[PDB]
Amino acid sequence: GPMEKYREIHQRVRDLAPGTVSALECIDLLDRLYAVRHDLVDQMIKHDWSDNKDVERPIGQVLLMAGIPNDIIQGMEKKIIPNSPSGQVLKSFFRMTPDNYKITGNLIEFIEVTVTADVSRGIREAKIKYEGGLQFVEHLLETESRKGNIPQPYKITFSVVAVKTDGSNISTQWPSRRNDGVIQHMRLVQADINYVREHLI
Numbered sequence: 001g002p003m004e005k006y007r008e009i010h011q012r013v014r015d016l017a018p019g020t021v022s023a024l025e026c027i028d029l030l031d032r033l034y035a036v037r038h039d040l041v042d043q044m045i046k047h048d049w050s051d052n053k054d055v056e057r058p059i060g061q062v063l064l065m066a067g068i069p070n071d072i073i074q075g076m077e078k079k080i081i082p083n084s085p086s087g088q089v090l091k092s093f094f095r096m097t098p099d100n101y102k103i104t105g106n107l108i109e110f111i112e113v114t115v116t117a118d119v120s121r122g123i124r125e126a127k128i129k130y131e132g133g134l135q136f137v138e139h140l141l142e143t144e145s146r147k148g149n150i151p152q153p154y155k156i157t158f159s160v161v162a163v164k165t166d167g168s169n170i171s172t173q174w175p176s177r178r179n180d181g182v183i184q185h186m187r188l189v190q191a192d193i194n195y196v197r198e199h200l201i
């Protein structure tokens with residue numbers, strides 16, 4: 001899988017200069033590993049759960065797909081998210097791309113996979129990004145519900161699935177028979193990651 005991507009990588013590392021001349025960007029390498037590091041855990045979700053088995057899909061299209069009339073959806077396209085640091089316009093916030101989602105009837109759920117060493121931060125980092133404007137939309141539905149322009153009010157759900165770089169909590173974050181597959185695939189890349197990190201400091 002995304003291991004085939006890690007494949008094409010671990011090449012470029014184990015042959016390396018000391019970090020003095022080195023690879024000026026171990027970063028491009030580094031970043032690459034992270035993407036892969038994220039994708040392993042994403043993949044697992046994309047099997048056991050998600051509606052998008054393909055790719056992460058924009059929030060606009062999620063909405064239509066949950067059967068919310070475009071004319072209503074373009075309704076909120078010009079508004080602005082409450083308590084936003086950036087003052088985000090829902091227009092933009094519909095181009096946003098969370099990793100995984102699932103519709104069931106009048107309910108919509110997102111799941112964001114992240115992985116760092118700092119759990120709450122990643123959780124914090126992402127909540128800050130989505131949960132603000134997701135409640136919004138949900139609310140701007142009931143608001144549109146109590147006027148009866150929809151049959152049913154929609155419930156919406158954003159959870160972050162975030163896993164220690166080691167994997168220890170994947171027990172608690174995402175129990176799956178794919179688990180033990182994932183933890184081990186992580187360990188491998190991690191060693192690469194750390195290595196590139198220990199070649200600087």
Ligand SMILES: [Mn+3]
Nearest residue numbers: 056097098099
């Ligand atoms: Mn993503």
Ligand SMILES: [Mn+3]
Nearest residue numbers: 099112113114
């Ligand atoms: Mn993510």
